[PDB]
Amino acid sequence: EGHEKADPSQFELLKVLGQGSFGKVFLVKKISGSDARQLYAMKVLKKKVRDRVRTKMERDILVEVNHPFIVKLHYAFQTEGKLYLILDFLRGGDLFTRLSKEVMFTEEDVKFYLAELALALDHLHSLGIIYRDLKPENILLDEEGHIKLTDFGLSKESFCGTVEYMAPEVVNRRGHTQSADWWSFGVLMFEMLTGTLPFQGKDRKETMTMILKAKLGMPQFLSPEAQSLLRMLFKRNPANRLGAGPDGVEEIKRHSFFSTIDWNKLYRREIHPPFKPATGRPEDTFYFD
């Protein structure tokens, strides 16, 4: 079932990439079909979630999601109390990891990732999907340098998550509109530029409290544009935030900050990424001569 029909005997398990509460990730290689020898990430989850006296696989949200800068569910299948999602395998690492090293990114490097993330978030909003936990660990990089949002945070719009990226209405549990996603957009931006989270205290309590009332002082090494965008993104009324309006994402798009960005070339991955990441493949690991 899923996006394409497939079974266990059509995949070859190579590694376990990681393991969490959600389930367990594998590196796998397709053995059948036209894409034989194509590497994938196999996410397998313990079948838990269920409603209306039927086990509802709410990883049916990836069916309609198809976009350059988002992960695509290639195949899917359930098997003896486990659901198996096959997704894109990205070998550039997180954007968290690069942040941990570089500390802060050039305004042009940030402009890039945000712009591609903007397109991603718009696509999801066009399907009525919101990204709960928009932290930097969810934004993976491909070997080119372009991004890909993971599916972990996906959820229909109609409590938990890293509190720093959470928006004020979400803290008060007033509902997770798509305006919340643009707040986290603001956080990711502030963080990538300052190497620091805009709201953070001694504990999760104080941090949440600060999100609600604590006035933020703009770091004055940020350009007028970057400041402008942040000030607009960080508004505690969701309806007054940038993005939450008639135009939608065009508000974000037509801003001084992105005034260098060719959104058509960006989409077609024709604009060059700022940083090419390292890969596990022998090309990037070996020494030479």
Ligand SMILES: Oc1c(F)cc(-c2cnccc2-c2ccc(N3CCOCC3)cc2)cc1F
């Ligand atoms: O749902 C997805 C998935 F399961 C995997 C990947 C993915 C694709 N290429 C390379 C690495 C990964 C990847 C590997 C491990 C993790 N984690 C470790 C365990 O706790 C959760 C986080 C996350 C991502 C992408 C997805 F969207």
